[PDB]
Amino acid sequence: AIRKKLVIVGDGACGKTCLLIVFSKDQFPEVYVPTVFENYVADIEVDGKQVELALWDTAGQEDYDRLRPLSYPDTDVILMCFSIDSPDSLENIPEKWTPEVKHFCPNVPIILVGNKKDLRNDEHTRRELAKMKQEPVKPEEGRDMANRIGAFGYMECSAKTKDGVREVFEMATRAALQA
Amino acid sequence: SMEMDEKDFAADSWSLAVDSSFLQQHKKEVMKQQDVIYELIQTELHHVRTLKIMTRLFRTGMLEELHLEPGVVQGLFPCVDELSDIHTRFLSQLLERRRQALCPGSTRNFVIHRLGDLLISQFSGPSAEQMCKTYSEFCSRHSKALKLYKELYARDKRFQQFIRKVTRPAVLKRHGVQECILLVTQRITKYPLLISRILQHSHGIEEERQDLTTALGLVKELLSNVDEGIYQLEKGARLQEIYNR
Numbered sequence: 001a002i003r004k005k006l007v008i009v010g011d012g013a014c015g016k017t018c019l020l021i022v023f024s025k026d027q028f029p030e031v032y033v034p035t036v037f038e039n040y041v042a043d044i045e046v047d048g049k050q051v052e053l054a055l056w057d058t059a060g061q062e063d064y065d066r067l068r069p070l071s072y073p074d075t076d077v078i079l080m081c082f083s084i085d086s087p088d089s090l091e092n093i094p095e096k097w098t099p100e101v102k103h104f105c106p107n108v109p110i111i112l113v114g115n116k117k118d119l120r121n122d123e124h125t126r127r128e129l130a131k132m133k134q135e136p137v138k139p140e141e142g143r144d145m146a147n148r149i150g151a152f153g154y155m156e157c158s159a160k161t162k163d164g165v166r167e168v169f170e171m172a173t174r175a176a177l178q179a
Numbered sequence: 180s181m182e183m184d185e186k187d188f189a190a191d192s193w194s195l196a197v198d199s200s201f202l203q204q205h206k207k208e209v210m211k212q213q214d215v216i217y218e219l220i221q222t223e224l225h226h227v228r229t230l231k232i233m234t235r236l237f238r239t240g241m242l243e244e245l246h247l248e249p250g251v252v253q254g255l256f257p258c259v260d261e262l263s264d265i266h267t268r269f270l271s272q273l274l275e276r277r278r279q280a281l282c283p284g285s286t287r288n289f290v291i292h293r294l295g296d297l298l299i300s301q302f303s304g305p306s307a308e309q310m311c312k313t314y315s316e317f318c319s320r321h322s323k324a325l326k327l328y329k330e331l332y333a334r335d336k337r338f339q340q341f342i343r344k345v346t347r348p349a350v351l352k353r354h355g356v357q358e359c360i361l362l363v364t365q366r367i368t369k370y371p372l373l374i375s376r377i378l379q380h381s382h383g384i385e386e387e388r389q390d391l392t393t394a395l396g397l398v399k400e401l402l403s404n405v406d407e408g409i410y411q412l413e414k415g416a417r418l419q420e421i422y423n424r
């Protein structure tokens with residue numbers, strides 16, 4: 001098993017912490033959803049290859065420009081997250097997060113991930129966003145942003161229902177393996 | 180960690196740690212507040228444990244088994260003794276607050292109503308000055324420690340055997356040398372997240388809401404000062420490269 005490192009980046013309300021918790025936990029968090037994520041080393045077998053994938057969160061580092069980059073050394077794959085219920089989290093991707101990741105992690109594959117896809121058909125979400133002349137992020141808007149920023153690929157998931165979660169981490173492992 | 184504390188913090192939440200007949204006696208809002216306070220103490224117990232792996236397993240093992248050049252071990256583990264002193268003291272106060280709150284006849288049923296005052300004490304005065312000074316030093320030496328580790332692992336056979344030996348057990352899976360360094364660097368930025376969520380469930384007593392609001396402000400001031408005091412050291416850096424920053 002080769003060792004690879006994954007780091008998730010994105011705005012504070014993008015759902016990155018919940019995504020790492022749901023993937024790593026044996027049994028879904030039905031009693032308490034943790035506030036923070038320390039680290040985890042997942043045993044993953046993708047396309048016949050065994051990998052130990054170390055998982056790291058940047059939550060809490062968003063306001064600290066000298067502390068935050070300390071999370072990047074030797075990263076093999078970046079998950080760049082936005083929330084589908086927050087078109088503002090998608091707007092911060094190209095000229096805030098993308099230049100930072102390209103500077104500290106040159107040549108590292110980025111997978112753009114649209115989190116909370118379950119809220120795309122949530123009436124409370126649709127009513128609230130409509131007050132600010134907004135709507136949930138459309139699939140084509142996510143794909144276009146991923147294309148624009150030079151992402152390895154575009155994926156969607158829901159930490160709430162677990163749909164798409166395993167696929168994101170299996171694809172991240174494949175990206176980390178590519179030379 | 181010691182067995183008594185590991186068992187007290189083995190459950191995934193405060194609601195699962197206490198007896199179900201004790202849980203049923205509390206309002207849902209008190210349960211939500213206690214679940215987040217339990218997570219802060221549990222993650223602090225784990226953070227002190229990460230520092231003990233660094234000092235006792237790695238640092239001491241290298242000094243007693245390997246023939247490294249002087250100043251090499253200090254370069255791999257900067258400030259680890261000072262960090263261990265700060266957090267072991269903080270952990271002792273959190274665990275004593277929990278212990279005093281236990282019901283007679285129980286080693287698991289408690290409610291902590293007054294955390295704010297303990298957090299203001301930790302994040303103000305001499306203890307905050309010491310945390311700020313120690314994290315500014317540690318985080319400025321973070322990149323240098325990682326590079327020194329990689330050089331030693333690639334060029335020294337006895338160092339590789341040592342690392343592979345002490346990191347072999349499954350309980351060390353998340354705690355290699357580089358993983359410990361990043362776990363310590365990331366610890367300080369977890370405090371505002373935990374404190375803000377505790378504060379969300381602490382409106383029942385105005386004195387407590389106020390104390391946690393003051394604590395959150397102090398932790399943010401400390402983080403801003405550490406962040407402004409960081410500049411990565413590089414082995415063999417020239418003065419011209421430094422003053423041309």
Ligand SMILES: COc1ccc2[nH]ccc2n1
Binds near residue numbers: 065066100103
């Ligand atoms: C967070 O600090 C930095 C430093 C250099 C950079 N270049 C582009 C983004 C960026 N961020």
Ligand SMILES: COc1ccc2[nH]ccc2n1
Binds near residue numbers: 033211
């Ligand atoms: C929304 O439901 C819950 C359940 C348990 C909890 N503990 C702390 C917050 C919290 N929320």
Ligand SMILES: COc1ccc2[nH]ccc2n1
Binds near residue numbers: 035372
């Ligand atoms: C998981 O829910 C969370 C996480 C972090 C938080 N900070 C303040 C509230 C709050 N809730």
